[PDB]
Automatic annotation (TrEMBL), chains A, B:
This is quinol--cytochrome-c reductase. Residues 27-198 form the Cytochrome c domain. Residues 69-90 are annotated as: Disordered. One of its GO terms (molecular function) is metal ion binding. Its EC number is 7.1.1.8. It is found in: Mitochondrion inner membrane. Binds 1 heme c group covalently per subunit. GO terms for cellular component: mitochondrial inner membrane; respiratory chain complex III. It catalyses: a quinol + 2 Fe(III)-[cytochrome c](out) = a quinone + 2 Fe(II)-[cytochrome c](out) + 2 H(+)(out). It is an enzyme of class 7 (translocase). The chain holds residues 85 to 328 of 330 of the full protein. Its cofactor is heme c. Keywords: Electron transport, Heme, Iron, Membrane, Metal-binding, Mitochondrion, Mitochondrion inner membrane, Respiratory chain, Translocase, Transmembrane, Transmembrane helix, Transport.
From TrEMBL, chain E:
It is found in: Mitochondrion inner membrane. Keywords: Electron transport, Membrane, Mitochondrion, Mitochondrion inner membrane, Respiratory chain, Transmembrane, Transmembrane helix, Transport. Component of the ubiquinol-cytochrome c oxidoreductase (cytochrome b-c1 complex, complex III, CIII), a multisubunit enzyme composed of 3 respiratory subunits cytochrome b, cytochrome c1 and Rieske protein, 2 core protein subunits, and additional low-molecular weight protein subunits. The chain holds residues 4 to 57 of 69 of the full protein. GO terms for cellular component: mitochondrial inner membrane; respiratory chain complex III. Component of the ubiquinol-cytochrome c oxidoreductase, a multisubunit transmembrane complex that is part of the mitochondrial electron transport chain which drives oxidative phosphorylation. The complex plays an important role in the uptake of multiple carbon sources present in different host niches. The keyword Transmembrane helix applies. GO terms for biological process: mitochondrial electron transport, ubiquinol to cytochrome c. This is Complex III subunit 9. It comes from Yarrowia lipolytica (strain CLIB 122 / E 150).
From TrEMBL, chain F:
It comes from the Eukaryota. Its main location: mitochondrion. It is found in: Mitochondrion inner membrane. Belongs to the UQCRQ/QCR8 family. It is a single-pass membrane protein. Component of the ubiquinol-cytochrome c oxidoreductase, a multisubunit transmembrane complex that is part of the mitochondrial electron transport chain which drives oxidative phosphorylation. The complex plays an important role in the uptake of multiple carbon sources present in different host niches. It holds the Pfam family UcrQ. Keywords: Electron transport, Membrane, Mitochondrion, Mitochondrion inner membrane, Respiratory chain, Transmembrane, Transmembrane helix, Transport. GO terms for biological process: mitochondrial electron transport, ubiquinol to cytochrome c. One of its GO terms (cellular component) is mitochondrial inner membrane. The lineage of its organism: Eukaryota, Fungi, Dikarya, Ascomycota, Saccharomycotina. This is Cytochrome b-c1 complex subunit 8.
Amino acid sequence: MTAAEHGLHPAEYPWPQNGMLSTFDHASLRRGYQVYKEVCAACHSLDRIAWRNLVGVTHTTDEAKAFAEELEYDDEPDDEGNPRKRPGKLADYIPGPYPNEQAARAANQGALPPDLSLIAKARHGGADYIFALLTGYPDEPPAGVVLAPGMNYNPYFPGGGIGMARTLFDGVVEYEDGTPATTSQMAKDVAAFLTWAAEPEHDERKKLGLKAIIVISAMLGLSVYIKKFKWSPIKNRKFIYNPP
Amino acid sequence: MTAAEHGLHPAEYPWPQNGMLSTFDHASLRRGYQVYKEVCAACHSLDRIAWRNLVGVTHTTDEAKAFAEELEYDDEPDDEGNPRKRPGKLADYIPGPYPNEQAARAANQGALPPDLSLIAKARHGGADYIFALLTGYPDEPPAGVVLAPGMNYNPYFPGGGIGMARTLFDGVVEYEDGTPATTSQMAKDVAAFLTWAAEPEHDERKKLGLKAIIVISAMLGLSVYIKKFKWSPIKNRKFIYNPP
Amino acid sequence: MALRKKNSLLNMANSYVLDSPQPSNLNYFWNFGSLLALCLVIQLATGITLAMHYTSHASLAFDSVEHIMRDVNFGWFIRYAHANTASFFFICIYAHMGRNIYYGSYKTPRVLPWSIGVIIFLLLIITAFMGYVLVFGQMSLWGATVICNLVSAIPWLGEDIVHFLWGGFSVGNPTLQRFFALHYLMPFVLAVFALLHLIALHTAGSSNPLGITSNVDKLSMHPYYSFKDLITVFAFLLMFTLFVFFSPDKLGHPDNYIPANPMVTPASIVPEWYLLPFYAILRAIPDKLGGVIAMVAAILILLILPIVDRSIIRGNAFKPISKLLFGFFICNFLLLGVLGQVHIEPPFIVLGQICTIFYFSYFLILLPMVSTIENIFFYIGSL
Amino acid sequence: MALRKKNSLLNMANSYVLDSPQPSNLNYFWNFGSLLALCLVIQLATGITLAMHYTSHASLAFDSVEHIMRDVNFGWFIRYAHANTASFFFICIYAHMGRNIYYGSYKTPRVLPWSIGVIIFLLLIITAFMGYVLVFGQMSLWGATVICNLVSAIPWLGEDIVHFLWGGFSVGNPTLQRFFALHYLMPFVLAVFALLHLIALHTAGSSNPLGITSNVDKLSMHPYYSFKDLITVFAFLLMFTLFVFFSPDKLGHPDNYIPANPMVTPASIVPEWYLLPFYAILRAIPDKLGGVIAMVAAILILLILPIVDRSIIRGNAFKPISKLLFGFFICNFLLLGVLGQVHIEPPFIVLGQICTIFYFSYFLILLPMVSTIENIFFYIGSL
Amino acid sequence: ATTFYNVFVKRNSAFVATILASAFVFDMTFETAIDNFWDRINAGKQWKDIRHKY
Amino acid sequence: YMGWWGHMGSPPQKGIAGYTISPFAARPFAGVVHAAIFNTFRRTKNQALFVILPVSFFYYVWTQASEKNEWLYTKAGRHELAKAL
Ligand code: HEC
Ligand code: HEC
Ligand code: HEM
Ligand code: HEM
Ligand code: HEM
Ligand code: HEM
Ligand SMILES: CCCCCC[C@H]1C(=O)O[C@H](C)[C@H](NC(=O)c2cccc(NC=O)c2O)C(=O)O[C@@H](C)[C@@H]1OC(=O)CC(C)C
Ligand SMILES: O=C1C(O)=C([C@H]2CC[C@@H](c3ccc(Cl)cc3)CC2)C(=O)c2ccccc21
């Protein structure tokens, strides 16, 4: 295909989590949540993440309970069977900005902002694609590109014309840890956070894999010793032939 | 248990559908629907029956479309993602009187009127139980029975005290076929209708069973001829023994 | 040499269904084995078909069964066929175990097929039960609760196992989905074991109603028993047809057409007709662990028939006293069945206990004693 | 006589896993059989476990897979293990069929295990595919559409069959629930066939890398090949671990993490890495029915290797020309794989067609010709 | 009678063809016959019998 | 313990001549009337007590228990039920 139609392939950034023994940087996850909450959540849902999922990853139990308790969720009907709301609990899912797809499209000049819970797994490139996309809006589209109405030029998005405008600008978030909130810093943080969102088991998975690699390596070494040992009578077998 | 705790066992009424080769009387089914619609539907849902299920059983396609089209059902949201209603179609389910259990209980002094789609299969006795129950409210409870508040005495219901009051009285329905709407007639019709509701395949089932009984009988007869035929060399085998 | 003998694959089929040498005098009670095979085939066909339509999620399970009844073409047939064949499977399997106990099929050299059979019997119970739960009606949910709490009898770890088998604090969605997985699986395991007990039997060959060797007089499995087995296939299908088409709910509990409500259990708790004997056993014993042990032991005790039958003669055709004892044992097992479905009230509480003692005393006391005495009566009586 | 030989059940196990006489010189390519057995065991364990957590209803399926990833303890492992082992299963099965083609395992007297094997290969494709669909992501839904429409190729009835398979007018809930049923079932059928092709092989015994008789020099399956198979078990688990724990999504398509939207087909449609060779075949042929036939024929044509290999010598160890031809055939099969995942653009359209012709010409032209010529070269060359 | 045996029964190909063609005829006629019988025993009961009113 | 055709493991047989006729030559239902009536009566009579004795005893036991149970839950059976509990 044309380069345009593919999208530019994102650079491979050296994420903290790249590397067989490397976890996410949880400080970055926390910062990235704050970017999601203050920028992306206006348009994008994170439906597959519950408040409890943040606990002991980015936030303490108490901070996440505070986030849940600020919201109202549908309770069971009252005793007259009238609908009720309750304050959120940790088992509740982070609520979306829009009640349905149609409302989402209405607010976005027809384009549907995807759920971000899985977006790091759902696109070639993963974290790198999210970081490249968020930071990759040129001030001017390359000469000759005709954007469809309500599209913005972003080379990383296939086709070039993405319905999402540039949204990260220096100091749209004020980080609570005093980190300078530059476009690149916020994109890295939110990209990390979203990658965690997509694969939250990541840290545990790599640790168990480390233990497995070690055990399985040792067992493979020993199994080869044992095989050679048991086979040595056959390998070492010698014949004397006296034709009868 | 005491008789009270069991409930009186209902009489075995000679329903049209009793009998291996007997269908429902569809005229009775239609009359019974009219009883459900005009009496029972105030309190009881029939959630498992769709308008299309009445078609070619009790009503023509057109009459059932007319019933569906009188109601409003939840449509897909409009283009701004605002909720909408549409007129009912034949695939829609007959809607309940109450939005939830709690609203049902609120309207029934705490008691929950069960869904009637399955009630003929869900109670020992089936049609007979429904007919016995609906017609079996004595004018006076047997001397000595203490009813709990908001309970009505009905011997067929286990415990004796049922939260459903007597509801069929001579001429609460005006049948469209000019049949005298007596308590017994309406109970028989609605009991038949509910039995159909629980087992709508009844008519087809018994017909296929008739064909199966005939084929399987013939095959059983022939299989016995063939077995005897093939075994006759062994059965007819004779021995002569000459001790050596 | 005939292809059927030459080719390794055909030769295995041949050895089971065609050339297999069978005694020439097997009576109609030898037909249950093939009916259980037919039930197993019907159950697999209807079962896999229901699995194409059934949804294991607790919010949808009961409704998916109603959808099967109402919307799926012939869904009613497939559902009732599956449910009813589960009942016929148990009639046939009690018949088959009956036949085996009466004709001493459990004695050497057939202890192995017998003992594998006892495991098939346990697996059938667990399969059929796991399948009962999938409807997620009232009885379904309660049955799940009780069966998954039989492991609470196991001390210390017991309570935790219960929670582990429920995947929750109560029977709920998790439980229903894991019962679906296992109910689909268990029948294939059961077909393996059914095959294995035949392979174990193939060393000795079938017993016969005289209990003598049949090595003197064998008949090929086909055509003789193939055609003999068709008679019962058609007789079975006649009975199947009468239930499936004419009275599909006679063998069912009304309460299972009520969706599962974890807040109430029906006042009239009565399990499947085939579990009733062991349920009465469980009710009889007033101890938790006791009740469970007795109920499981009622099946596992069949494993000791090879030991406790001390007869020098195989099976009961020729033993008037053993036949009478077997008659009382069978009728007692039916009485237990009956007591399983009355209310837990006087005088049936004491009666159920007496029947439970009689059930166990057949294996532990009466059979060993009667079989010893009849040995002596044969020897003295024929001198 | 040893119990393992006396007892009928043990004797069957014994004959397969312990006393089974194997040639003494099987090399590491004889290890794929047991790896495929291990894959099959892993798939059954993880599969049945996912079935305890997965909900087949289209409204819930994708979400139940996310719930498995996120909420179920070790769900991530079980899911990725199941998904990755499906890839390893195909690496091993191509390796295993590779081994068989290179060493002439398809020749007499092993045509039967070979031919049963070809059916196992088709069943694996259908199993793994039906399994792909259960996620009900974007690639899943489209995959379902495509495969059920391969029956549309069949004229007249074809189109009605498609609707019958879907249970609808499109792939939807009905389809997904029936794929769940059959995906659970298909692996047990596949384990039967895997067992059968071993039983068929047990008449001739394993071939060996020299292609000579091994009747002169046999070695018990255990301990020698048991311990030899452990080496590859651990080597397999090392590779499994690297994928499952470190890169679980390397072998996956991102688009399957988008829920199924029947309105849009991903611009970049590319199936599982293992179906790619036949997908390129399907893309190559411009006719509908042609494309389908060719794709199926690419598997079924393996059935004719027993006929078209005219060699008097079993396998390729000693045939330089055949080894070169086999090298080009394998590389062409890998090229087809590669062309399966490029865009349908020049010049790869023509290239894919040339590779498709080369694929078929190996069975129809080259193998018969080369094998004939090498026969003559052996005879003349040794005179 | 020999003739009938020779034509329809002697060759198994012919016998199986005859059985399947008879099964076809039986299947079609049995269906029709039971349909009519079922309508006669349940006369005035079934939807087809009251449909005319609407 | 059982062999296969040719080596079934019968003690050597000698001196038994077995004769049978073709299924086509025999009437498969010959003497069916006689058998259905007289033979089945014979076989039923000989086994009757083995069924009748346990069925009649356990039917008696059930009958007594069900009648007592019924009676205990009447007004007349109030006192005997109070003792039983
Ligand atoms: C006010 C709107 C809006 C805001 C703010 C917004 N987005 Fe989006 N986003 C969209 C829309 C609309 C699309 C769909 C674009 C399309 O498909 O043409 C989208 C698409 C995306 C995509 C995927 C594009 C693709 O490959 O399909 C990612 C990833 C993304 N957004 C992440 C973010 C992150 C991270 C933020 C902020 C930190 C963010 N978005 C802020 C509206 C928004
Ligand atoms: C205004 C209320 C009301 C009307 C009208 C009503 N019911 Fe009910 N019905 C109930 C309530 C409440 C119960 C629950 C009683 C209880 O469980 O104590 C009930 C219970 C039943 C039951 C089952 C009782 C049981 O066994 O659980 C059936 C059957 C039934 N109704 C059928 C009907 C039919 C048929 C009609 C009219 C043709 C009807 N009902 C009219 C309120 C009503
Ligand atoms: C799925 C369930 C089962 C099937 C399909 C099955 C099938 C069979 C078959 C076909 C036979 C040989 C023919 C026959 O005697 O009827 C047989 C024999 C036998 N079965 Fe079963 N069986 C099953 C369950 C059981 C159970 C639960 C037991 C024991 C508790 C059992 C014990 C035996 C024994 C001991 C034999 C040898 C009996 C003899 O021929 O004397 N089987 N079974
Ligand atoms: C021995 C084999 C089997 C037995 C004894 C058995 C028994 C049962 C029983 C008793 C039920 C309850 C039926 C009801 O009351 O509705 C049931 C339900 C079910 N069975 Fe099976 N079953 C068997 C095999 C299978 C198999 C192989 C499948 C394959 C999936 C299966 C799938 C189902 C399903 C989906 C249900 C629930 C839907 C329903 O209730 O009808 N069964 N089974
Ligand atoms: C579930 C998949 C399969 C399993 C588990 C399996 C397993 C095995 C095993 C254990 C052996 C004996 C040891 C060995 O040679 O590696 C074997 C041999 C064989 N398999 Fe497979 N197999 C499978 C699929 C296939 C397929 C797809 C084919 C052919 C297309 C095939 C054809 C053969 C042949 C021809 C042999 C004899 C080869 C020889 O030893 O020379 N198998 N298989
Ligand atoms: C040869 C054996 C098997 C193969 C090759 C196979 C292959 C697959 C594949 C490729 C998937 C898609 C996985 C994904 O991308 O998420 C899958 C999913 C699934 N398989 Fe299997 N499978 C096998 C056996 C089984 C068995 C025995 C079960 C028993 C139910 C099973 C249950 C599932 C379930 C529930 C899913 C969907 C959940 C998921 O995607 O992880 N599989 N299978
Ligand atoms: C347990 C009783 C049932 C018998 C079947 C069990 C398994 C069985 O036969 O195991 C054997 C170990 C067999 N390998 C060989 O023949 C073998 C022969 C020569 C060389 C090597 N390796 C070289 O270095 C071998 O590995 C094997 O891996 O075959 C599995 C597939 C079988 O499972 C099944 O078919 C059932 C199902 C799980 C597929
Ligand atoms: O209380 C019980 C109960 O006890 C069983 C019982 C009876 C048979 C038992 C059993 C018998 C034999 C074996 Cl080998 C294992 C379990 C299983 C539990 C049920 O099936 C049941 C179903 C529905 C509601 C309540 C109940």
